[PDB]
Design a protein around this ligand. Structure first.
Ligand code: HSE
Ligand code: HSE
Lengths: 375, 366
């Protein structure tokens, strides 16, 4: 039983039915929202699975409007003759399980006709791969040419490569580690505590109450945005300068402060706090080594050709983590470094430099697929 | 009469009267808490001023108990034989202006007998130096051999050296920069917003209501504690290991999360949210160049012999900031590099390596 791909650029909803989660909970009636660019090859051997990060969605490329609150999160990276060449490749992006942009998440109605809220299960990165796999299977896709993602996207791509090495030709893994680190769990669990401390959280059951913990989420987002930026670049841009016509020595704002307020407010206009909590806990859960004897054993086991990218100034997934991935994956020829001042967010900002790592990944994927014989 | 020094180890309260603050606001009836170790020399010429950081107090050295929630924040640094050798030196530490362990802060009673709360003015690092100097003068002390501090204590040390070069013989400036960075203001201002978001903040007039924004302050402290850690040390200590037998895939805690919850909980038993906010805003205000032609002009103006120390793994005051200080201060012979895994908090953890920089500071004092 198969469902069609939606028209290029348009959101489709793929109903995958019940999903068994890693912790044994069965999540009934899951829907995954999908967008796609490029035509699916007759052998279905040309799928590039584009995996969004924490606040991304299915909208990889294109303008805001027509139900999209933002332009594509990798705008220009996909299209005819772009780094993801949609004259040859079928670029498919899901909204991750737990999301708020069309896929089943805490805001979605449970079988009892009420929002999941506090009843939404704890999900892992492996759960997110399982939901994406079932979505692709519902579209009649069983094999993918390449998985490509940065950050939570990189965690998704890596778990996909390690879990289904027989069903993926190649991967780009950007700005992530093999497992969540203490620092990342530290900041992720404290961002969650910020949301859960807001009185409007209502134990997670705020959905449809007309009150939401957006203030808690804005606080979390201000702290998260700093982890995503380059320390030096921030100081070059704002230093200790005041906001326009305000005096910080008598309670006015600094320019960086005003900026973080703005970033907070942007997110509150387009993103659900419950989704923030569920995806931040999923990020804390990241560990390719779990149930496999640890990170070294998991990665040494994986034969898939993988391009690994790190950003020089990344303060959240520092370069030592992508060095460790590159060294342990036998299919990784060595580390690619994105020389960016923009920190972790450089995987979204440096579209030309990331563009080149994507081109080499898909050059590799095409050669491997041409030489890969499967049912 | 001068105010007498308290007996060694004991808290004294030094009333300094009204204080004019940099923003113009006048703060009446200021008290500064002091503790000291060692005898004041007959000539009153052997004072080493110890300047605590964000959540420190006057309690530099000794055990917890007898009115002290914690042991000395620099235990062993001052004493007989110690880096601050109390056989020769008089080690004096204040509780900073704005603090909650004996000095005038937001929790202290204003002249109308109600807590300052939301009436407490915005103070700067420079105001903290003016208040400490007033305390010393009331004790009959107009000159100091040396000032020593890290973090907010480094900011205080630096402003002291740069504002009053004729009244200090030598300085130790640890783990700070000439001015607050955009990143430091980002995290400091967001820690403040977390406390003001807690509904128990009550506009800052929560004092005496029986509700305080300790939840907000725990959140702030959890984020702040991460900025103080070495990234690699933290991962070496906890990794992604669970707390005890808890299972994080069904709602249990990670070992680091549990450690961060302990950090927030411990600070909530000993520290006031209003002080957190007020001192966080003074850190954001840090700028040795304000009113002085900027940072280069101010630092190049300072003739004082200074030891500048930086922690290699520091992620909040990265070592490029101490290299800038070491270069521009004419009295600095070069950057003292503290090879530590412990991050910013290295300046508190590495008492042996910091001990050496203190001895070199006191050699320069003579
Ligand atoms: N800023 C991006 C990167 C997260 O690592 C996001 O919000 O999705
Ligand atoms: N960790 C210490 C130093 C932070 O600068 C404190 O809380 O004061």
């Amino acid at each position: 039983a198969t469902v069609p791909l939606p028209a290029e650029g348009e959101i489709g909803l793929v109903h995958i039915g019940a999903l068994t989660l890693e912790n044994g909970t069965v999540l009934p009636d899951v829907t995954i929202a999908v967008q796609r660019w490029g035509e699916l090859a007759p052998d279905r051997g040309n799928v590039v699975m584009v995996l969004h990060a924490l606040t991304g969605d299915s909208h990889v490329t294109g303008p805001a409007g027509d139900g999209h609150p933002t332009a594509g999160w990798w705008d220009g990276v996909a299209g005819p003759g772009a780094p993801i060449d949609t004259d040859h490749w079928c670029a498919i992006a899901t909204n991750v399980l737990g999301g708020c942009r069309g896929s089943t998440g805490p805001g979605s109605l449970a079988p009892d006709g009420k929002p999941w809220g506090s009843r939404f299960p704890q999900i892992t990165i492996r759960d997110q791969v399982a939901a994406d796999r079932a979505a692709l299977a519902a579209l009649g896709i069983t094999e993918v040419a390449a998985v490509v993602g940065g950050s939570m996207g990189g965690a998704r791509a890596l778990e996909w490569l390690v879990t289904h090495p027989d069903d993926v030709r190649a991967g780009l893994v950007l700005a992530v580690g093999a497992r969540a680190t203490a620092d990342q769990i530290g900041t992720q669990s404290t961002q969650v505590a910020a949301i859960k401390a807001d009185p409007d959280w209502q134990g997670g059951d705020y959905h449809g109450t007309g009150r939401a913990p957006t203030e808690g989420m804005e606080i979390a987002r201000r702290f998260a945005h700093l982890t995503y930026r380059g320390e030096e670049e921030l100081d070059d841009r704002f230093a200790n300068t005041p906001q326009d016509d305000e005096d910080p020595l008598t309670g006015g704002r600094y320019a960086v402060q005003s900026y973080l307020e703005y970033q907070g407010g942007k997110l509150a206009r387009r993103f659900d706090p419950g989704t923030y909590v569920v995806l931040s806990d999923a990020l804390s859960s990241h560990d390719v080594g779990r149930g496999r004897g640890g990170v070294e054993a998991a990665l040494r086991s994986c034969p898939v050709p993988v391009v690994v990218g790190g950003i020089t100034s990344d303060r959240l997934y520092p370069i030592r983590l992508q060095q460790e991935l590159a060294e342990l994956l036998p299919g990784c020829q060595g580390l690619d470094v994105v020389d960016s001042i923009y920190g972790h967010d450089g995987f979204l900002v440096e579209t030309e430099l990331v563009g080149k790592l994507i081109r080499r990944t898909l050059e590799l994927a095409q050669r491997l697929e041409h030489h890969h014989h499967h049912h």
